[PDB]
């Protein structure tokens, strides 16, 4: 297992290899990130939310999340979206990320991205994409404004009851 964003990730299937890669933000800033290449499935376990995640290289395929309340579920979703390394997440950074402030000198770009969206996730959520759902019993869709829906949801994301 390993820890990212306050969650313990445990791989349940698949595998990956690591390599450094450049990516471009919405403000055309170049970031170097360690990309994981491979299809993998994980459990994500936090103190206030849990999830099942399926991902491929820089793609979130499925996230089923449950938790105490909207704030904890939203935080899990943010951590999963950043962890996915998806282009739409990188492109949702619309101004420059600061690496020079003394308090940011030991954050790698993945952790700079995470902090950015923890401060404010509106642009992330509005640019991720939505899809119609054929709602499954015991689950529900979640919209970009973090309200529930039986008709639409953030792409790949569903909320479960505890």
List residues near ligand MGT by CB under 6 A: 2, 4, 11, 16, 34, 36, 40, 83, 85, 108, 110-111
Minimum CB separation of residue 109 from ligand MGT in Å reads 8
Using DSSP bridges, classify how beta strands 49-56 and 152-154 pair: parallel, antiparallel or unpaired: unpaired
Place of tokens 């999963």: 80
Q: Which does residue 11 bind out of ligand MGT, Cl ion, none, counting CB within 5 to 8 angstroms by kind? A: ligand MGT
- Residue among 159, 162, 1, 9 at smallest CA distance from 82: 9
CA–CA separation, 84 and 60 (whole Å): 5
| The binder of Cl ion chosen from 31, 75, 83, 130 (CB under 5 A) | 75
| The binder of Cl ion chosen from 10, 18, 32, 47 (CB under 5 A) | 47
CA pseudo-torsion sign 74, 5, 118, 156? negative
- Residue among 142, 145, 150, 144 at smallest CA distance from 49: 142
Binding pattern for the stretch 96-135 against Cl ion, x by CB under 5 A and - elsewhere: ----------------------------------------
Tokens of 135: 């709602």
Scanning 74-82, 83-91, 97-105, 142-150 for contacts with Cl ion by CB under 5 A, the matching segment is 74-82
**Closer of 50 and 85 to ligand MGT (Cβ):** 85
Q: In 109-160, which ranges are E strands?
A: 130-132, 139-142, 148-149, 152-154, 157-160
Tokens of 130: 């939505």
Minimum CB separation of residue 54 from ligand MGT in Å reads 11
Q: Which does residue 16 bind out of Cl ion, ligand MGT, none, counting CB within 5 to 8 angstroms by kind? A: ligand MGT
Q: By Cβ distance, which residue is nearest to ligand MGT?
A: 36
Q: Which does residue 83 bind out of Cl ion, ligand MGT, none, counting CB within 5 to 8 angstroms by kind? A: ligand MGT
Contacts 24+ apart (CB under 8 A), 35-39: 35/85, 36/85, 38/14, 39/14
């Amino acid at each position: 297992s390993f820890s990212f964003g306050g969650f313990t990730f445990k791989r349940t299937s698949g595998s990956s290899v690591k390599k450094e890669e450049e990516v471009l933000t919405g403000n055309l800033q170049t970031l170097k990130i360690r990309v994981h290449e491979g299809y993998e499935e994980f459990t994500m376990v936090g103190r206030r939310a849990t999830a099942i995640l399926r991902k491929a290289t820089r793609r979130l395929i499925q996230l089923i999340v449950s938790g105490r309340d909207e704030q904890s579920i939203a935080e899990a979703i943010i951590v999963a979206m950043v962890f996915s390394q998806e282009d739409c997440m990188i492109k949702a950074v619309r101004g420059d990320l600061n690496f020079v402030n003394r308090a940011n000198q030991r954050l790698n770009p993945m952790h700079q991205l995470l902090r950015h969206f923890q401060k404010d996730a509106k642009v992330l959520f509005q640019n991720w994409g939505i899809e119609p759902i054929d709602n499954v019993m015991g689950m529900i869709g979640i919209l970009p404004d973090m309200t529930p829906s039986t008709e639409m949801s953030l792409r790949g994301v569903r909320v479960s009851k505890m």
